[PDB]
Write a protein that binds this ligand. Sequence first.
Ligand SMILES: NC(=O)C1=CN([C@@H]2O[C@H](COP(=O)(O)OP(=O)(O)OC[C@H]3O[C@@H](n4cnc5c(N)ncnc54)[C@H](OP(=O)(O)O)[C@@H]3O)[C@@H](O)[C@H]2O)C=CC1
Ligand SMILES: NC(=O)C1=CN([C@@H]2O[C@H](COP(=O)(O)OP(=O)(O)OC[C@H]3O[C@@H](n4cnc5c(N)ncnc54)[C@H](OP(=O)(O)O)[C@@H]3O)[C@@H](O)[C@H]2O)C=CC1
Ligand SMILES: Nc1nc2[nH]cc(Cc3ccc(C(=O)Nc4cc(C(=O)O)ccc4CC(=O)O)cc3)c2c(=O)[nH]1
Ligand SMILES: Nc1nc2[nH]cc(Cc3ccc(C(=O)Nc4cc(C(=O)O)ccc4CC(=O)O)cc3)c2c(=O)[nH]1
Ligand SMILES: CN(Cc1cnc2nc(N)nc(N)c2n1)c1ccc(C(=O)N[C@@H](CCC(=O)O)C(=O)O)cc1
Ligand SMILES: CN(Cc1cnc2nc(N)nc(N)c2n1)c1ccc(C(=O)N[C@@H](CCC(=O)O)C(=O)O)cc1
Ligand SMILES: O=c1[nH]c(=O)n([C@H]2C[C@H](O)[C@@H](COP(=O)(O)O)O2)cc1F
Ligand SMILES: O=c1[nH]c(=O)n([C@H]2C[C@H](O)[C@@H](COP(=O)(O)O)O2)cc1F
Lengths: 507, 506
Amino acid sequence: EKNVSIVVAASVLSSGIGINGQLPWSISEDLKFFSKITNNKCDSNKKNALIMGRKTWDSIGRRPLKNRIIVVISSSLPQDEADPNVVVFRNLEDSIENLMNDDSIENIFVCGGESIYRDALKDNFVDRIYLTRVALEDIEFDTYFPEIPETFLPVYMSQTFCTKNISYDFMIFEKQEKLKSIDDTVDLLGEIFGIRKMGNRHKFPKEEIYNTPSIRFGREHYEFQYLDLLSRVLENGAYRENRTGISTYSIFGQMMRFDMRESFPLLTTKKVAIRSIFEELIWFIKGDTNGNHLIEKKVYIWSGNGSKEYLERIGLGHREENDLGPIYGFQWRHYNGEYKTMHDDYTGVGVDQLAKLIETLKNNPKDRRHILTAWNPSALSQMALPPCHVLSQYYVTNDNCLSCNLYQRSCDLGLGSPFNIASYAILTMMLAQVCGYEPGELAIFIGDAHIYENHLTQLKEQLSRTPRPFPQLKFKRKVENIEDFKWEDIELIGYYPYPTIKMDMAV
Amino acid sequence: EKNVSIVVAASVLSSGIGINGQLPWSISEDLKFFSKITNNKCDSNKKNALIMGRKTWDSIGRRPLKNRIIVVISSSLPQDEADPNVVVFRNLEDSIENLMNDDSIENIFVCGGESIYRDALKDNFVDRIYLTRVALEDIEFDTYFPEIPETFLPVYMSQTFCTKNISYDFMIFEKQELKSIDDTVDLLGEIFGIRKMGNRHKFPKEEIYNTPSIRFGREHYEFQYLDLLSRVLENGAYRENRTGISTYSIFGQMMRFDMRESFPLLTTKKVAIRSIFEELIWFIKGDTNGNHLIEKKVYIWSGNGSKEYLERIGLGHREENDLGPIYGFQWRHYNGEYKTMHDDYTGVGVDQLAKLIETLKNNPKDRRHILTAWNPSALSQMALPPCHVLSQYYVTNDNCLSCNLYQRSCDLGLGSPFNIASYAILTMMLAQVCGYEPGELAIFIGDAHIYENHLTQLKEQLSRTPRPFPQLKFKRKVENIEDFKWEDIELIGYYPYPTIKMDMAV
Ligand SMILES: NC(=O)C1=CN([C@@H]2O[C@H](COP(=O)(O)OP(=O)(O)OC[C@H]3O[C@@H](n4cnc5c(N)ncnc54)[C@H](OP(=O)(O)O)[C@@H]3O)[C@@H](O)[C@H]2O)C=CC1
Ligand SMILES: NC(=O)C1=CN([C@@H]2O[C@H](COP(=O)(O)OP(=O)(O)OC[C@H]3O[C@@H](n4cnc5c(N)ncnc54)[C@H](OP(=O)(O)O)[C@@H]3O)[C@@H](O)[C@H]2O)C=CC1
Ligand SMILES: Nc1nc2[nH]cc(Cc3ccc(C(=O)Nc4cc(C(=O)O)ccc4CC(=O)O)cc3)c2c(=O)[nH]1
Ligand SMILES: Nc1nc2[nH]cc(Cc3ccc(C(=O)Nc4cc(C(=O)O)ccc4CC(=O)O)cc3)c2c(=O)[nH]1
Ligand SMILES: CN(Cc1cnc2nc(N)nc(N)c2n1)c1ccc(C(=O)N[C@@H](CCC(=O)O)C(=O)O)cc1
Ligand SMILES: CN(Cc1cnc2nc(N)nc(N)c2n1)c1ccc(C(=O)N[C@@H](CCC(=O)O)C(=O)O)cc1
Ligand SMILES: O=c1[nH]c(=O)n([C@H]2C[C@H](O)[C@@H](COP(=O)(O)O)O2)cc1F
Ligand SMILES: O=c1[nH]c(=O)n([C@H]2C[C@H](O)[C@@H](COP(=O)(O)O)O2)cc1F
């Protein structure tokens, strides 16, 4: 008995693997993965066997692979014994003569197109699947990878990588069949001390609220940094009241990291309105607090906090309909500026923090003070809503990459959080291009991480969806000033999300 | 064959376990731990055997323990067969008749004082040690727990618990004698070099990992700081800064601390707790006069407040130690027109700390309890921009006050141990004035760095296995938060390692 694994690279939705006798793409890093995963062995005096079909054998030029024995399944190829690195069998069952015989073969790999993939799964020969999901779906396929049967469970999902603006990840599927004393001692201490033991205040989420719970040790995909935060809130969130009529389940002190070098952290478990995120971000940068400029561009996310009824409730009945007051983008461009109304001209007033940030980022990159704040206690009472994303710090690595850290005092995990993840990712990328750097990492530190109680059935639905590789975000042109970005200048490549989920905002 | 474990509660330094035929302390949670750890079994038709010496058998009243069979080692006690829950053997060697025979016993526990402990380790009978370190050392002991032999390695260290202002933790010692996922991740790390984010956050090597045998049981929250040191030494990029001393820096790190059952004061190094407090009360009082700290023998702000340093950053018009509007001037007089350190600022600016205290008790579930120090209109007037920039506070449902701090730049050698204790005390002060209890402390860090002249020092600190945190209690209740004094603070059970000298980069 030995191991039999499948190596395959299929598209993310339709699981396409080929077209016209060749691959639908050209990803060199994926081929290197095929090389290292099929050459990985222990016994130096043994080799691995790679089973493939005839049409696949033709697609690789009918030439052997170094240090590996290729097994071709064909009904016509002559069983020539001249080449010891290439052997031909008449059927897939007989080809698996390496389990009970031929001790020179250590591991077995299946990689031979739809015919061999489907027959290897139907006849129950495969123990493990190495899947490379490619984010390409509006192209033509003629051979597909069969749907993974229910007997397999995912145990690993890598981060999203990029090659020629093509997103792809790497997954491992295992076939289900059926320290030791440290966990017991911790459980006993949790019975003695109830809430006195901090571990009992941060309980690990139950399987029923854990997204794809079979992936236990391989939660590398950074969308899990958000999905696992939802699970931790559903498990430990305290039922609390707030200024709105809608209570939340809240915990305090959480973080989540995202990579921006090889992907863009736009959630795939739900179709996120990327256009509204951008139009809000450019709305901040331009220094604008007029809420009508977003409604004029069909962006209604700031309508609730800018109605005549809401403004009179918080004591701002003297303002216009959508006069949100000095908020994000007024502390960015005119910090400590005497705010009047949304119609006045504030050019030159206040401290232009964003400009000083951009100028400092290229003139002194290793400076430890690249900070953009929005918490002005002298102007909180004039704001329609105090800042949620309060403070952000920026950092230039040695390889000329721009990372970003954000502190968020209050995080609506249902609506605001997916917006804040993408918004500050775009902002860092904008700052990276204007300063001549590359995107780095994104860390978001959260204070009051909460779920509104009317989002429970929606967020539980979102947790039932296994994530997909992140898309790519590229800029079409180089701008001279950061205020010059437009929505047409943004290209979103390879975004194949799950259907959108409607959730109401608590005003 | 079955398992043989030792259960013991010894003091933190001298490993004392008894005095005059009784325990040196009275910790009820420790007895429950002994109860649950000796009753833990699988087979319902089997019992666990507790081996003890005669003097220990007398100390527990010579009465049996429920659901367990007690084995007494004595040379005089009669081998009475009347009680089946109490059996007597003449020596510890003969007593181990439960391993290869007598299948009714599942697990074996040794817990019988110094005489049995020392012979159980000398004759090499013990597979595991359950140690309860108690932070009591200036009392009298007469029986000690023998030094743990080198064949045992720690595999678990719990958080610090508190009982009657007594700190104690729980450790597990073991005697040294997925599958395909780790390989696939390594291969991806060879294909993509620094393109894979995992390679930018490499796990620290064993040579720089504090107590590396504790792999799955790093519960003690001092590891939240020691492991941050390890991550910097592994991935820190050599970078220059405004000082002449370069650092190894990483970006985006955090560490949590408990304040309910302990106080996060580092034990791997004797931290100057008095200087931390006098600086914190100096902030609360709204003071920027750097002489008031030197008058109280606190020299931490001397480097950033000298005539030479102030002229260099363009503040030569200030007095010697006039640090300018810094911490405690943005707390009490935010956006206030700063003049000098001698002027009267009563009533000017926005008093954030006062508004914070009033909001914490009048509206605890409010999500806006924020105390900021980053004022871009006054950065040029400051002798040093704020490192601990923003802090947020949170009132739990059980009336506990937690704290979140964002720190833009963190000197892990000097500033970090100060910032951990400083914001812990501040949260406790806010908790008493508002009528709550201390909760949790989370510190989010931007530029977490180590100065290159701290390398041999911090590597020395990583060689020390941590000890349970001390306790911090206030002797009296104050009416206003500014009224705290150093005499009002009682530090209980602080037994740290010797201090480590490190120079500050000006
Ligand atoms: N993305 C990826 O990971 C991979 C993609 N591909 C792509 O898939 C395409 C090729 O795959 P595909 O079209 O399905 O053809 P196959 O690679 O599956 O090969 C099929 C051939 O194998 C022989 N064969 C298959 N089944 C049997 C059987 N039950 N008994 C005897 N002989 C059998 C036959 O050869 P004969 O004519 O001699 O009878 C048959 O024509 C290409 O585009 C290729 O690039 C291929 C491998 C991997
Ligand atoms: N903190 C903790 O976890 C614990 C603390 N303790 C404390 O320790 C103290 C008691 O320990 P200690 O003073 O060392 O006494 P012991 O509990 O170790 O008991 C010793 C007695 O056991 C018998 N005995 C010991 N060794 C042998 C041997 N090799 N052969 C035959 N008989 C033997 C002898 O009794 P005999 O005279 O009959 O021959 C001896 O006097 C108490 O204060 C107790 O409270 C005890 C247990 C746990
Ligand atoms: N309580 C509270 N008050 C707040 N005031 C201001 C904000 C910011 C904000 C306000 C509204 C939204 C919003 O509707 N988003 C949205 C989310 C999803 C989804 O992600 O499922 C899908 C579609 C949309 C709308 C669209 O279609 O564009 C997002 C962000 C805010 C908040 O989030 N919560
Ligand atoms: N670069 C830089 N600039 C900064 N400006 C202001 C600070 C705050 C600060 C300034 C100085 C210290 C300091 O000397 N601490 C200290 C540490 C140990 C030890 O823990 O081994 C032992 C003794 C002491 C002194 C004592 O004896 O009290 C601590 C904190 C700061 C900084 O830390 N770094
Ligand atoms: C059967 N086949 C089609 C093909 C293409 N991409 C895939 N990608 C994946 N993830 N899995 C597969 N089974 C797979 N198969 C192959 C097999 C080997 C090579 C190949 O050229 N292998 C060289 C790769 C050289 C390299 O660039 O380092 C090797 O050393 O094995 C190409 C296509
Ligand atoms: C031998 N001995 C001394 C003693 C005291 N503290 C210790 N503490 C530790 N960590 N380990 C020991 N071996 C230990 N031994 C004992 C043993 C049992 C009880 C005892 O009363 N046990 C009850 C405890 C009841 C409880 O409070 O729940 C039980 O159910 O086991 C007291 C002292
Ligand atoms: O960017 C935002 N992110 C966010 O999470 N919220 C949510 C958090 C919370 O539900 C509400 C803020 O109300 P409060 O100040 O009371 O926490 O808005 C709002 C934003 F504008
Ligand atoms: O409370 C403090 N914590 C801290 O870590 N520093 C260190 C961080 C850094 O080593 C230096 C500030 O230099 P910079 O302004 O370049 O960050 O002070 C200073 C404090 F006052």
